[PDB]
Design a protein around this ligand. Sequence first.
Ligand code: HEM
Ligand code: HEM
Ligand SMILES: [Mg+2]
Lengths: 353, 353
Amino acid sequence: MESAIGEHLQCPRTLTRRVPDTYTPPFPMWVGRADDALQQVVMGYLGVQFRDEDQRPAALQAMRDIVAGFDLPDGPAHHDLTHHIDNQGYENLIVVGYWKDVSSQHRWSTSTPIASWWESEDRLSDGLGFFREIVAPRAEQFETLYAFQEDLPGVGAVMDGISGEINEHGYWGSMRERFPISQTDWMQASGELRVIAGDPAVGGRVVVRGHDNIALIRSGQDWADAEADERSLYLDEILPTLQSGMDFLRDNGPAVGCYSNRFVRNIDIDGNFLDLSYNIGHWASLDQLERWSESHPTHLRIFTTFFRVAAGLSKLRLYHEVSVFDAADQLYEYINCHPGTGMLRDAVTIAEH
Amino acid sequence: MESAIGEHLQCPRTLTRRVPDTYTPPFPMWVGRADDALQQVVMGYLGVQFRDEDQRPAALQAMRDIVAGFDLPDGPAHHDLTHHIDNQGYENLIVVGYWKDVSSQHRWSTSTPIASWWESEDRLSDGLGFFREIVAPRAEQFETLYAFQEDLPGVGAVMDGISGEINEHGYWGSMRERFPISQTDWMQASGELRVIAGDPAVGGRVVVRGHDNIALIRSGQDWADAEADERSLYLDEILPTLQSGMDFLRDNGPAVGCYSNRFVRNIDIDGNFLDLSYNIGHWASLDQLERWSESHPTHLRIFTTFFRVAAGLSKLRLYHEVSVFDAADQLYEYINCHPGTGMLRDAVTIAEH
Ligand code: HEM
Ligand code: HEM
Ligand SMILES: [Mg+2]
């Protein structure tokens, strides 16, 4: 069988898998493929936050301004738009951009139209919240998994194509093994999520730095092309269990090591909902993510519910991408967001250390 | 933290764990310890089988004869007695003995009073079924896990003591990592479960040989010391899930790679029930046992229910022992047993391979 790890990323092992090499997965799954040109990507989650209805026009315009900047030289190779309401009752529009290299994203961010917009006094006077959560995993530091082969969302869209059926899935610990770095590295978390400028409690501009091997999961659901009975199966049987799990991570984050949990629905440029959704989850460690997925009743309920109704599925599209990052390859910037936004909730404040 | 692997069995690794060094389990568990003298143990399951009520006195007396043989030189260091009814309606009394070394068990088994009884033509004429399922893992080939510290049942009873709190538990795959041989070996199954003498379809004396890395789990429950409120919790909430899982494995064995599944209840010498039970499960591979425990809805139901009710438990005792063996260290012998008994069911006959 094909391996989840790209040919060019395969190397002499020092760390080994948890299954013997006779292992054969019980069902087909696929991963994104890319050659050695794709060395390190940039995932940039750009947000607009508001709570009052009268702020919606301004927020939607801000989102449109951000998307317009994505067309400029060195804009991202791919992007999508989402909406969610957080546990403080704030609406959040997030545009996620994927760049195929670090220098392009840097040239983009430092260009006049983009840099003057982000540094503008308008950002403090708009009354909206703004954030940028920008992470740059190397090709060895992310893994994908798709229950389909065509039209890959997320990071898959900036990769070169699709694999054949892969071996490293269908057992807990398989996510870890799909990370090419797992051949060598434990991806052990160390350090603190830290405020380096400002104060969350006062608002204004706040900058947060990450620590070694923060993990980010984007796990998605696409039911747009499903027919009547299958859509009914996702909506009636699968989603309530998924919602319960998302609610748990959103409201019990510190207890399990989840810095931020967002359950988001795709939108068009006008804010209308599309039949695609995903979790955006930031974790204190890959291993804390492993433990929750494999042993918390919430994901296990999702897991067993899936296999119970799996026979009636065919058009539903389920996938995830998971990334870990060097300490230095992350920045989380906030402007006028509430103190529980993203990395602001759990970051250690400047006095605190 | 202490390791589940005895100090004298720790060696340079070719195979690694699935958790980083920082891993700390969320609840305490302990393992049996034995010093460098213990090199290989013997687990001898000696059974008496019958279905007619008029056979019960002879069956219980045969069980007493077996227990009496344990008082002879080189008898086992520990034993216990159990009862179950199999899916063919036969009652099975099983006396399990544990020996601290292979040679002592061999000396006992070949001694005149023991060998003459097993080889007697009276075993054919008794009308009862008899069986000996005797397996001998090296110290590097078995692991134990106890959710308690005192009065170890099973193989723990013949070990030297109890460990402190251990690191290698609380995640799927931890069982494998508690096997000292996992440091260097995949414990990959190979070969066939083979009839080597006799014919299961004709009855009489049948002899079955195991293959490399068959796995045997004894997973036990002891509620004898629990008070009323906890007794009800186990019997009403936990036991039904366990029963469901055991029935599944008993009746769908070939589908999941479980050669033989028994859910047995401890009894005293007179056949009266005790409030201790355990699974005796023989598996085609350790990894099939891994797959079932971690991903089959039956054990996941057991596992999720346990953590749901865990707060109401304190005196309930849960544990397991899991072993793998070379082909040569397994002997499965049957006298007038029905053809679904233990390893008779799935064994390949002389010309089938
Ligand atoms: C309806 C939605 C979901 C379904 C049906 C589902 C189902 C599953 C399945 C079947 C697997 C095993 C995949 C394989 O290896 O073949 C899996 C793995 C995993 N899922 Fe989910 N999941 C869902 C949503 C989520 C979400 C929102 C998260 C975010 C925390 C999540 C986290 C994980 C992780 C971390 C793994 C990897 C476990 C490992 O390989 O060690 N899942 N999921
Ligand atoms: C009411 C009875 C049972 C309960 C409450 C239960 C619960 C659990 C728990 C909590 C664990 C995790 C232990 C740890 O690592 O800390 C576990 C592991 C395991 N259980 Fe069960 N269990 C029960 C019965 C059984 C039975 C009868 C079997 C027979 C196949 C079984 C097979 C396994 C295996 C093979 C593992 C190891 C998983 C691994 O580390 O990869 N369990 N069980
Ligand atoms: Mg590193």
